[PDB]
């Protein structure tokens, strides 16, 4: 009659560890096509009904929301990969899951997982030491300031639809990173706006901030769109004649009183409307719509206004001209105003776009992209995001290691020799760790269409011949040196990946039982 769990499912034993292994393979198998710049993209449909397609492991695992506890640990460690580094969230989960696959036959042989986890901790400790030996300090050495940024951005943009126009896109990509303080570089500070229509090579770089120009209200052919030093005013409240929401009940029996209450509704609005002119600002920006009466009164005094501007764009305006948002039109102070070097409304893409240009106080920028289709430009923007992260980390981190299979093979190469000196179960565990490091160069060839059998075996040949820098060429299929091909990643990525993947692996291998309470 009595029950221990009161109907709360709890399972233990070696079968629970196997169930944790199958969960790590399921998460790995989903991220395998998303590994590498040429890797395939995953189709994810969230319960929010927003269909997204991306290859970035961070965004992928955040939108899946896997309830499985052992599989959720691989998601939590991927968010740590997005925190400590921010790049490589796809490879850290695949490598951690591969450690679960290589530890599966050891569980059937009767080898305890604690000796397996202890073997990885000694393997990573030797692996990080080899990465420090593979860390090459380079700043001005055999490279200039311009060639270091350009030649590294061309490789990230290679094998893409932008390959032919890459010469123009590297110039805007390098100038985008140099437009910000090299001490603190944030990808969020670089704005990117997609412009439908037009040629890809005609894209422009804006030093200031731009937005969509969502103003739908009539009164056009006025309010000149080109200003030299406009005074930008950030507004909150609603200046439209006929208001959005509220109202009032007024009972009057006279005809002159009918026109009076209509003029009263006008005078109450015109009061705060005239206070905008008393500030003497040429640009009026508000997150709420600016009605026909307001845009007409601004047209007579030659004041430009745009309503219903996104909040994300208004925050960049504050970071551009150094202004501030004031709630009312009365108390507006002079320091809340701001000014740019040039203001123009561009018709590029058969659509009107307001832009601020030449802001000396701007901590952010905006880069416009053009193309024949909105989906193609989105691929250009994401291929640019991969190029920005390489250019950004090049200045922030001067210690680099050869990527694209180069470093992955050298770490796996030496640990096979280090395992010869160690005897016992730890020898087969280190050999399994070095074998688990072979999944990274493998999936890079499988996702790009290259043959995994020939290229990997040929890579194991020349790399064993005394040259440590041989990677996998992503352009023309062959083995080659990525140090010459300029495939570069900082040493902190390879160190934090081996530390985070083994950590998440050690947390899952240490779980004998999963207790889930229902309620």
């Amino acid at each position: 009659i009595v029950v221990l769990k009161e109907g709360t499912d709890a399972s233990q034993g070696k079968g629970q560890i196997i169930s944790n292994i199958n969960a790590c393979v399921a998460v790995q198998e989903a991220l395998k096509p998303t590994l590498g710049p040429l890797g395939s993209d995953i189709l994810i449909v969230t319960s929010n009904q927003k269909t997204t397609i991306s290859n970035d492991g961070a965004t992928i695992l955040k939108l899946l929301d896997v309830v499985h506890p052992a599989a959720k640990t691989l998601v939590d460690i991927s968010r740590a990969q997005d925190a400590e580094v921010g790049d490589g969230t796809t490879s850290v989960t695949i490598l951690a899951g591969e450690l679960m696959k290589e530890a599966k036959p050891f569980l059937e042989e009767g080898i305890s997982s604690h000796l397996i986890m202890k073997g990885y901790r000694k393997a990573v400790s030797l692996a990080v030491e080899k990465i420090n030996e593979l860390a090459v300090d380079i700043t001005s050495e055999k490279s200039s300031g311009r060639e270091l940024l350009e030649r590294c951005a061309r490789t990230a943009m290679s094998s893409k639809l932008i390959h032919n126009n890459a010469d123009f896109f590297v110039k805007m990509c390098v100038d985008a990173v140099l437009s910000l303080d090299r001490n603190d570089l944030d990808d969020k500070l670089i704005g990117i706006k997609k412009i439908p229509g037009g040629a890809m090579e005609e894209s422009l770089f804006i030093n200031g901030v731009a937005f969509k120009k969502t103003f739908s209200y009539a009164g056009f052919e006025q309010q000149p769109k080109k200003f030299n030093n406009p005074k930008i005013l950030s507004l909150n409240v609603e200046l439209e004649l006929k208001a959005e929401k509220d109202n009032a009940e007024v009972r009057v029996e006279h005809v002159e009183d009918y026109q009076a209450i209509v003029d009263a509704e006008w005078q109450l609005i015109f009061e705060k409307l005239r206070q905008v002119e008393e500030t003497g600002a040429n640009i009026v920006l508000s997150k709420l719509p600016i009605g026909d009466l307001a845009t007409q009164f601004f047209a007579d005094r030659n004041i430009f206004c745009a309503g219903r501007v996104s909040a994300d764009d208004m925050n960049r305006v504050i970071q551009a001209v150094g202004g501030s948002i004031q709630s009312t039109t009365s108390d507006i102070k002079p320091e809340h105003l701001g000014t740019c070097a040039l203001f123009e409304e561009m018709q590029i893409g058969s659509e009107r776009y307001n832009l601020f240009q030449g802001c000396p106080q701007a901590k952010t920028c905006t880069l416009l992209l053009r193309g024949g289709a909105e989906q193609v430009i989105a691929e250009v923007e994401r291929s640019l995001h991969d190029a920005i992260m390489i250019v950004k980390r090049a200045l922030q981190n001067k210690l680099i290691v050869a990527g694209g299979g180069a470093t992955e093979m050298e770490v796996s190469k030496c640990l096979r020799d280090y395992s010869k000196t160690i005897a016992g179960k730890q020898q087969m565990i280190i050999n399994a760790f070095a074998k688990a490091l072979e999944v990274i160069p493998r999936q890079l060839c499988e996702n790009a269409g290259f043959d995994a059998i020939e290229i990997l075996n040929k890579l194991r040949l020349a790399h064993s011949k005394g040259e440590k820098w041989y990677g996998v060429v992503f352009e023309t299929e062959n083995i080659g040196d990525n140090f010459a091909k300029f495939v570069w990643e900082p040493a902190l990525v390879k160190i934090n990946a081996l530390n985070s993947a083994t950590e998440a692996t050690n947390l899952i291998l240490s779980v004998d039982e999963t207790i889930t309470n229902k309620g």
């Binding site: 009659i1 009595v2 029950v3 221990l4 769990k5 009161e6 709360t8 709890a10 233990q12 506890p69 052992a70 959720k72 640990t73 939590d76 740590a80 400590e84 080898i111 305890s112 604690h114 000796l115 202890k118 016992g424 950590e503 947390l507 240490s510 779980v511 004998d512 039982e513 999963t514 207790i515 889930t516 309470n517 229902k518 309620g519």
Partner: protein, 543 residues
């Protein structure tokens, strides 16, 4: 067609004891016993606990598991209550009670299958318990002088960090021992007033850095910023602090006293009223020597203006739980009214400043070598927020383990790492064959039940049980030509991650178990095993 007999109560399922119901009760414990076998030890395993609120929890401590599990069966429920007996009176040894009491019932199945009466089984363990407690008093090797030195505290804390957080054992030991020595006074020949409360050590954490960058503060740290324009106090000694329950504003009535507004003429008088009254009250506070005012409630705008001209640091603590421990450092008392900072309610603080911890600015509360503090703070740093929270749970259990070092005979120690359990095997079996009667059956099996502790640590460490265990038995069996026995009391169970021909000694790493922890664990494990053996049947009713 088939009638029913034996159940006269109501429609139920009747379980007679002739079917081995007492064995089925132990079998239900064996399901839970195997859960604790992967817990104890630094090589133990962590269990994923999904809370009923949809929260993921991964921890080694089994007391959290039993708290999240809802128990019905009595033999398991008594072990849960027995775990609370070990959890309330001590902050360590919870896995010792669950594993030992489970094995005592496992070896009892051989006596039950033999036909030995349950009462005669209980009588055997009770006589063997008195033989064990007599040995546990003689198993004591060293004892701490209560010098409270840092190195002396490391000897106690080092084995406590083990079995919970491994690899941080040496790093966390320097962090915990420093915080204990701050709130632990050095005194002797006084047993009237208890010392070292659990609340004496506060633990905070922040993302970033690692355990190497962690620091220990001699006082409590507040997360809130110095709202007032005075960021920190001066270098003058003994700054007076004031804790006010009433918010900082114009003087009001203790009962109600809500300010109402009617006409704009009153608002002009309310402004000037708050200007003169606050400036009059805050000036008298500064004249009495109080440079810091702790406000448990809100602070007005004019209250900030006048205190900044007097150089008084404004510090707000809306949490009443932090104010309770705050009174244990300086000694200040909260005042329900405002304007009368009685010097008996005023405290003393050496230093109040603002430090940057993990990128965020925090205002601390601390002292240097004066007006001894009963509350300390451990600032933890780490890259993983989940693992950093588990370190906090390991430190909090380490603080409650130092509580066992107080007056109730906590200085004496016994060899740990499975060294004590092996010697008790030879001592009890010596009493088994020596004591005549049927008790020799249960007494000898009582010593065999201690073989689970060395075997559990060996199974979790991946070591061969067919090797370490028989070598550990021969390690304590020697022939000494004399009364005093020698050679080796120090052979334990081996923790190796890098092998080692044979086993090591306790004297090398100084890893031991406390007497107050071991002696209390034996009493709880036997009473829990006695309770299960005392139940030969169950009775239930319709809910």
């Amino acid at each position: 067609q088939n009638p029913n007999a034996g159940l006269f109560k109501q429609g139920y399922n009747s379980y007679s004891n002739a079917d081995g119901q007492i064995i089925k009760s132990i079998a239900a414990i064996r399901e839970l016993h195997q859960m604790c076998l992967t817990s104890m030890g630094p090589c133990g395993r962590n269990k994923i606990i999904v809370n009923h609120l949809g929260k993921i929890i991964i921890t080694n401590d089994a007391a959290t598991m039993l708290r999240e599990l809802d128990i019905v069966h009595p033999a398991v429920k008594v072990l849960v209550m027995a775990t609370e007996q070990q959890k309330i009176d001590m902050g360590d040894g919870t896995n010792l009670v669950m594993i030992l009491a489970g094995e005592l019932l496992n070896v009892s199945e051989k006596l039950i299958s033999m036909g030995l009466s349950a009462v005669e089984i209980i009588q055997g363990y009770n006589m063997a318990r008195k033989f064990t407690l007599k040995e546990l008093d003689e198993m004591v090797v060293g004892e701490i002088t209560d010098k409270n030195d840092k190195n002396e505290l490391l000897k106690m804390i080092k084995p406590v960090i083990s079995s919970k957080k491994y690899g941080s054992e040496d790093i966390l030991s320097e962090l915990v021992s420093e915080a204990v020595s701050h709130v632990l006074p050095v005194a002797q020949q006084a047993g009237e007033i208890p010392y070292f409360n659990v609340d004496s050590i506060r633990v905070v954490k922040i993302m970033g850095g690692s355990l190497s960058n962690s620091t220990v503060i001699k006082g409590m740290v507040f997360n809130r910023e110095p709202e007032g324009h005075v960021k920190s106090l001066s270098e003058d000694k003994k700054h007076k602090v004031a804790v006010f329950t009433c918010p900082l504003d114009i003087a009001n009535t203790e009962t109600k006293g809500t300010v109402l507004l009617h006409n704009a003429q009153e608002m002009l008088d309310f402004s000037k009223g708050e200007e003169k009254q606050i400036d009059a009250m805050m000036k008298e506070i500064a004249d009495m020597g109080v440079e810091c005012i702790v406000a448990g409630a809100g602070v007005g705008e004019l209250a900030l203006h006048y205190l900044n001209r007097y150089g008084i640091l404004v510090l707000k603590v809306p949490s009443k739980f932090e104010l309770r421990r705050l009174c244990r450092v300086c000694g200040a008392t909260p005042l329900p009214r405002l304007g009368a900072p009685t010097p008996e309610e005023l405290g003393l603080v050496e230093t109040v400043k603002t430090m940057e911890i993990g990128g965020d600015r925090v205002t601390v509360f601390k002292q240097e070598q004066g007006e001894i503090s009963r509350t300390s703070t451990i600032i933890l740093r780490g890259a993983t927020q989940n693992n950093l929270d588990d370190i906090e749970r390991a430190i909090d259990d380490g603080v409650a383990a130092v509580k066992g070092l107080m007056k109730p005979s906590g200085g004496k120690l016994l060899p740990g790492a499975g060294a004590t359990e092996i010697e008790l095997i030879s001592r009890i079996t010596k009493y088994g064959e020596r004591t005549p009667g049927l008790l020799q059956l249960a007494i000898k099996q009582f010593a065999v039940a201690f073989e689970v502790v060395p075997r559990t640590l060996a199974e979790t460490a991946g070591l061969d049980v067919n090797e370490v265990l028989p070598n550990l038995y021969a390690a304590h069996n020697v022939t000494e030509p004399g009364a005093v026995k020698t050679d080796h009391l120090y052979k334990g169970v081996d923790i190796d991650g890098e092998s080692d021909e044979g086993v090591k000694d306790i004297r090398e790493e100084n890893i031991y178990d406390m007497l107050a922890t071991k002696k209390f664990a034996i009493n709880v494990a036997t009473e829990a095993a006695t309770t299960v053996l005392s139940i030969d049947q169950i009775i239930m009713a319709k809910k």
